[PDB]
């Protein structure tokens, strides 16, 4: 029917999208900068692949959620 169902409260209150995006984007950007810095300042002999991979993963993760939430905040609401 219709009475059994109840109002669809969103999982994330929209008023929190801007701040949530900012911090996530900031963290992601910082990680990306670190990766690029590490890439620039590293000789062939000293290039730990585990470190690179882990930093890459964390950076991409944060950047992805950041961009998504930023897009959402812009009012496209994908």
Report the interface residues with another protein, using CB under 8 A: 2, 4-10, 12, 14, 35, 39, 49, 52-53, 56-57, 59-61, 63-65, 67-68, 71-72, 75-78
> Is 52 within 8 Å of 38 (Cβ atoms)?
yes
Minimal distance in Å, beta carbon 64 to another protein?
3
Minimal distance in Å, beta carbon 27 to another protein?
14
Tokens of 53: 């991979």
- Report in angstroms the alpha-carbon separations of 27 from 3, 39, 63, 76: 44, 18, 8, 23
- Which residue number, 44 or 78, has a Cβ lying nearer to another protein? 78
């Amino acid at each position: 029917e219709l009475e059994a169902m109840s109002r669809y409260t969103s999982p994330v209150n929209p008023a929190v999208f801007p701040h949530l995006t900012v911090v996530l984007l900031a963290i992601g950007m910082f990680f990306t900068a670190w990766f690029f810095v590490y890439e620039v300042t590293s000789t062939k002999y000293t290039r730990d692949i585990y470190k690179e991979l882990l930093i890459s993963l964390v950076a991409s993760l944060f950047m992805g959620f950041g961009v998504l939430f930023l897009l959402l905040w812009v009012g496209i609401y994908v």
